[PDB]
Design an enzyme around this catalytic site. Sequence first.
Site, PDB file in Angstrom:
ATOM      1  N   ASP A 165      -0.169  -9.075  14.489  1.00  0.00           N
ATOM      2  CA  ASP A 165      -1.396  -8.305  14.314  1.00  0.00           C
ATOM      3  C   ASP A 165      -2.514  -9.250  13.829  1.00  0.00           C
ATOM      4  OD1 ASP A 165      -3.454  -6.527  13.675  1.00  0.00           O
ATOM      5  OD2 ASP A 165      -2.339  -5.478  12.109  1.00  0.00           O
ATOM      6  N   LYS A 205     -13.260 -11.880  14.639  1.00  0.00           N
ATOM      7  CA  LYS A 205     -12.830 -10.823  15.567  1.00  0.00           C
ATOM      8  C   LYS A 205     -14.007 -10.029  16.171  1.00  0.00           C
ATOM      9  CE  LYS A 205      -9.344  -7.193  16.058  1.00  0.00           C
ATOM     10  NZ  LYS A 205      -8.056  -6.716  15.428  1.00  0.00           N
ATOM     11  N   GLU A 265      -3.488  -2.559  20.047  1.00  0.00           N
ATOM     12  CA  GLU A 265      -3.047  -2.145  18.712  1.00  0.00           C
ATOM     13  C   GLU A 265      -2.426  -0.714  18.606  1.00  0.00           C
ATOM     14  OE1 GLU A 265      -6.572  -3.041  16.371  1.00  0.00           O
ATOM     15  OE2 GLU A 265      -6.326  -5.173  16.683  1.00  0.00           O
ATOM     16  N   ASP A 308      -6.455   5.315  12.925  1.00  0.00           N
ATOM     17  CA  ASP A 308      -6.380   3.982  12.307  1.00  0.00           C
ATOM     18  C   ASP A 308      -7.590   3.739  11.399  1.00  0.00           C
ATOM     19  OD1 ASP A 308      -6.130   1.219  11.633  1.00  0.00           O
ATOM     20  OD2 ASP A 308      -6.010   0.576  13.739  1.00  0.00           O
TER      21      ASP A 308
END
Lengths: 629, 379
Positions: free
Chosen positions: B7, B68, B172, B196
């Site tokens: 991850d 990211k 994900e 999430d």
Amino acid sequence: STPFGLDLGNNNSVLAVARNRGIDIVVNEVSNRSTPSVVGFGPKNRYLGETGKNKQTSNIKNTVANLKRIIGLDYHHPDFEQESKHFTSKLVELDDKKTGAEVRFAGEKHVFSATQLAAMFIDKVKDTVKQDTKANITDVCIAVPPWYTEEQRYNIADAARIAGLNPVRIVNDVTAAGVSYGIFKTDLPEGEEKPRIVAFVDIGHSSYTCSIMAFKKGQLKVLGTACDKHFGGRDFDLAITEHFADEFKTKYKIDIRENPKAYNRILTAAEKLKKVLSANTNAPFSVESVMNDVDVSSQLSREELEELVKPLLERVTEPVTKALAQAKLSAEEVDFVEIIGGTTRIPTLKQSISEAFGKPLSTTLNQDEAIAKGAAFICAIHSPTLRVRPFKFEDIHPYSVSYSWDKQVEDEDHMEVFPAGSSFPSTKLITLNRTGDFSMAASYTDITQLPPNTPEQIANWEITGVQLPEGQDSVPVKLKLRCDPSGLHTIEEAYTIEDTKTVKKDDLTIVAHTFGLDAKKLNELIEKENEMLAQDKLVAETEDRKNTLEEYIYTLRGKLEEEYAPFASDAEKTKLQGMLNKAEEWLYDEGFDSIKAKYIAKYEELASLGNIIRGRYLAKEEEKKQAIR
Amino acid sequence: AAAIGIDLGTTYSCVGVFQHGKVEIIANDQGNRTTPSYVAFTDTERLIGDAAKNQVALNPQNTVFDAKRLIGRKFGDPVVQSDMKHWPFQVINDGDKPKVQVSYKGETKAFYPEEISSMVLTKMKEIAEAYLGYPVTNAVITVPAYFNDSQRQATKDAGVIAGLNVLRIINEPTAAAIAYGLDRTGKGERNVLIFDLGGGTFDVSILTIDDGIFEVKATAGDTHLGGEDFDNRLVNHFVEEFKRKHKKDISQNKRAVRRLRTACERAKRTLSSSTQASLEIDSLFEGIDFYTSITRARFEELCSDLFRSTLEPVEKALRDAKLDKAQIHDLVLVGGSTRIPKVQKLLQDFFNGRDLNKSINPDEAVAYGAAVQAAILMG
Ligand SMILES: Nc1ncnc2c1ncn2[C@@H]1O[C@H](COP(=O)(O)OP(=O)(O)OP(=O)(O)O)[C@@H](O)[C@H]1O
Ligand SMILES: [K+]
Ligand SMILES: [Mg+2]
Ligand SMILES: [Mg+2]
Ligand SMILES: [Mg+2]
């Protein structure tokens, strides 16, 4: 019943269980994989584990930690001060010369023994496990430091019993880690092949253990074990706190040593600075209002830290060199060095361990979990119902133990039974010629080889029921002498011989005097623990019902204004709004601190009306779906 | 040699490996089961992970995080331009490719986003190698469901720079689903909502699963909720208490509020696992002790709108998917904020008491599924 392994640490404890494929870590109510080893006390209930830690800083005088360290501790033990300097709570002498904690609890002054206190923590942590497993927990394997005394092992086993558990084995913690290493690795030497020699180094909050073991597939033997019980994380935190105590006197004109609460804030902050220094070479130290209005702002380098613990570090290679000498090995005969324990993350320690073995360090176990996992595997070995893949292990028996008996007609009246540097568990068979009933005892053969102030005598027994046959001179008694899987010295069998053939005659009765509690005392302490448990549970339940009522008030009020609006008459709605408002005001008045039944009743009054309206809402919801399909 | 699942998170990263029939999440050398996606540059060295994050306050311009948000994007991307306003480090333009610009060893240096990410991936790889005892060379790496080809490929490039063979780049929420075995349920479509929430960032995804085959139905990003706002509600509430009890106002006192705020952050966390929490601030204001308590129900109510707002992206995602809430078969909770009981309660009450897949640590469930998938792709 699911096997349960407990790594009982001075700072935190890890919970593992044997189920499904194998061995799982049990997570607590805060989702943590370890639980703080803390027992605190309040006006209404106990604060155990995470809650003990939560309440710790505002309740320092009634919070006991270091549970491990006060088990079996003589109040006037020459090294008592090395233990008590880490206590924030009041310690007192007990009727047996051991140490307990005195504590304000439920409006009174209470004294609890170290055994009792450990039982409270084991009970909490047992409840964590059954909450997670939804199953019965009746058996534990507890891991303890190899320096635990015979007495201390009995004491912790009795703590388990007070918490309603059968202590199946009390295992040496680094041995349990070795078992988890042996059941997890898949390429161990197999036949006539040379064993794999692995050194294990655990440094935790309080202890430094080195233990060297031989591995073949399906087996280990421990070769050598040495401990420094005064070498751990807490010694680093304390050196940091004392450094700043001195610095702040000069820098801020404040004296934290005269202010226990101020001192405790620095101590807590110092552990965090310590951890930053395992990753960074420099770190700021900032604590806000350590006293009234005074914010401190300093720093510490890794180099400065290392100099602070210079006196402690002078001992850094001793457990390695001692464990090697016991094993009769040079450093070069060790194949791999495995580190576990949180304090082995300090770079200066890592350098010293590596240099002492002349090897790189291996980190192929989970360092926090290995001891707990091995303890859960060992608990499963003892399960009569859970078949586990077999693994055999022997632990080192560092001291010579003799047994003695009434001389009577025997030439000798004692003998060495369990030699220094043998293995446990072990069974020895003797037969003695006997004139009648007789006493026995187990003792250390050479007391100079034990820690200072160790009593020579371990245990003693009376054997009765001895009856001479016609030829009325003597009769042979066969005895089974046992150093058990916990390393405890017992007598498990005594019987008279010959009632052409030589058979057994009479099984003899044995009265044992050990460090273990009597059935009477044990049951009295079991009762006390049940009362405190019921009291905690009642308070937690009434707290829960009162929160549930308050939540329902806000929830039902909000819905009556939204999705429930089309589903209640004017009279129904205003009536329910009136009682919601009244229930809310009650929570500030009589209901601020009320009884369980009343929070339940107040809820049932509201819900009984709320559900009539919800019912109509749900019915029209299904009707919309009937119009769909 | 096992393959590892990584991850690669915006704030924190996590690595696991499937071994002896199970996923092991691997702790770093500080003992942490997640590692900050941070890279710091100083006069002498480069710091990655916890070390990088530990010194951020004292070296904020040379400590890079959130790479990211840049990865696989153009400099003129309104997202890049928007995001820049919030970062204390410099972002420059290199032929319409953003580079983070830093002082390193007494020199100005610029790095592509995928270079920063490769350093984080090298760290996770080394963590896995220390635990396994041998070189690791194969990895599944996860990305958000909304990642385009360019963002996916740049993430794969970061992998390759870090010395990894990238077995697959996977979504994900797909990873979270594999963690819970939702791809083991045979033929027939099941609609899965992955919720999430954690670390400011908020992603809802609806996947459809049929015979272990995944299709993305919707993604909804309400991705700034969760931090200071809940704290503010508790501070304002308690300021009002002190106002009430002592007839004095503590509002215009910098140190006193920061002290009260600190106590409020602690209390909030306690209220995830207890139904009440005590506050105890010695000499809060002008020599007065402030000892009080707050229930979980009271705190939820103070923040009722802030909590209720988490359902907005759920309803949005259901609309894009063209599904009704009764058509969602399965719920998966990932991210740290899903530990908050009210988040679980709101969600569960919205979907009429449907069960939640939630037993796997919500910070670890994505690395968990990437590790399972990496093992599958190896054998
Ligand atoms: N990264 C780190 N650097 C330095 N010290 C650390 C780090 N992480 C944890 N520690 C320290 O390790 C200690 C806890 O380790 P561990 O869990 O092995 O102890 P324990 O089992 O409770 O203690 P013991 O075995 O002595 O009874 C704490 O003092 C903690 O501060
Ligand atoms: K521990
Ligand atoms: Mg330990
Ligand atoms: Mg068995
Ligand atoms: Mg299906």
